[PDB]
Each structure stands twice: as structure tokens, then as C-alpha cells.
């Protein structure tokens, strides 16, 4: 259930800690697809810790360790946690980006926090109902 | 330099597109 990453188990968490800290600071990070998927679960669970409450002593220990820069700790409890109070999940949006042209052809993805102030990503759009096939399906729906 | 003199280096060295392929010479 875990990708074999880092020179050791500590490295993965430290690397995840570095990745998590950067995402919180910027709210949108571009990284290899495998890393983005692995860290997406941690980011969602971190938001839950923010929702748990600022007064929660356990959340501080988790936040303090995971976030090297301590200015982010107030942000998580006073920016991220208030922002996601309405949301029940899916706080992070991860999308596949074309592979890096760096001679290694790594799989790339972009992970961002939803509700951010950054410009909206170019998300895919499903076909409109005005299409001929959809219009035909609409007629079948109306009859039923 | 002496006598309180100072030195500063001087600033030395201060066819038609519509009809292509036919030379414009041609009137034909």
C-alpha cells in the first residue's frame, strides 16, 4: 500500500515532509506523477487535522514535524482549515502533466489545494448535452 | 601620483506577392 521510495523509510517521510511543506506554502506544486499520488493522501489527512481544531495538541505535533517552516502552522489552522470546513474531502486536485523533456522522461503531475487563489487549472470538460448523441439520449430520458 | 594629483582614464573610442515566381522585371 506504499511506494518503495527514499534511501530509507525516514527519507520517504522527510521527502514527503519537504513535498508537503512546499505545497502548503505555494498551494500548487509540479512533481513526478508517482510522488504526487503518494503525497495526495497525506495532504488530505493533514486538512482533517486542521479541521480537528487548532487547540488540538496532537495536531500541533503532526503539523510541527511535517511542516519545517513554522509560519505555515498558523496558516494551516487559520487558512487551510477554515477554507475546507464546508468540504468533506477532495481537498487536493492532482492532474497529469506531459512528461519532462529532461532526457529521463519522468511522469509528471501537478498537485494543488482546492479553493486556492491561483488561476484555475485547465481541467477537462465533458461533452455538452447539446451534442447529437446527447440530444438523442435526452429524448430517451424524456420518454421514460 | 604625488602633489595630490589624481588620474582618471580618458574615454577613448567614445517580385509581387500576388504574382510570385515571375520576376518584377516582366511586364507580361
Amino acid at each position: 500500500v506504499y511506494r518503495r521510495l527514499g534511501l530509507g523509510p525516514e527519507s520517504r517521510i522527510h521527502l514527503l515532509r519537504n513535498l508537503l511543506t512546499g505545497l502548503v506554502r505555494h498551494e500548487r506544486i509540479e512533481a513526478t506523477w508517482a510522488r504526487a499520488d503518494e503525497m495526495r493522501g497525506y495532504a488530505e489527512k493533514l486538512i482533517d487535522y486542521g479541521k480537528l481544531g487548532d487547540t488540538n495538541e496532537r495536531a500541533m505535533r503532526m503539523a510541527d514535524f511535517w511542516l519545517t517552516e513554522k509560519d505555515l502552522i498558523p496558516k494551516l489552522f487559520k487558512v487551510l482549515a477554515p477554507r475546507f470546513q464546508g468540504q468533506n474531502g477532495n481537498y487536493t486536485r492532482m492532474l497529469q502533466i506531459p512528461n519532462r523533456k529532461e532526457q529521463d522522461r519522468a511522469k509528471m503531475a501537478v498537485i494543488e489545494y482546492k479553493g486556492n487563489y491561483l488561476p484555475p487549472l485547465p481541467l477537462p470538460h465533458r461533452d455538452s448535452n447539446l451534442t447529437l448523441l446527447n440530444q438523442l439520449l435526452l429524448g430517451l430520458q424524456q420518454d421514460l | 601620483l604625488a602633489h595630490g594629483q589624481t588620474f582618471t582614464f580618458p574615454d577613448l573610442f567614445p517580385s509581387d506577392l500576388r504574382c510570385p515566381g515571375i520576376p518584377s522585371w516582366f511586364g507580361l
Binding site: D71, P74, K75, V79, V110, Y117, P119, P120, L121 | -
Partner: protein, 60 residues
Amino acid sequence: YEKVRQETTKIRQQIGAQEGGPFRAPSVETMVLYTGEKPSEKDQGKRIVERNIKRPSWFT
């Protein structure tokens, strides 16, 4: 997507200058405003980023 990243870098540059120091991440929400758009009451209690460019057509 290249446009989004380029705009993101420009937005991030403005934020960095406004903060003026390392480890100065605000504990309050952040918002971006472009020329022709002025801070409103709803923008109160949120960090405001001012962009000299006008509101991009794609960005809403």
C-alpha cells in the same frame, strides 16, 4: 498549461515582494486582484495581491 504556470510565477513574484521576508506566510486567506478590480469588503481579512496586468480572460 504553460500560460497558467507563467501567470503563477508572476503572481508568486508579487507575493514574495509583498511579504518582504522569509518565513512570513500569513495566517489569513489570500486573494489576487488585477488592474481594474479594487479590493472589496469581501476581500477584507484576506491577503490581497495586486497585479499590474488586467484580469486575464481565462482567469475568472
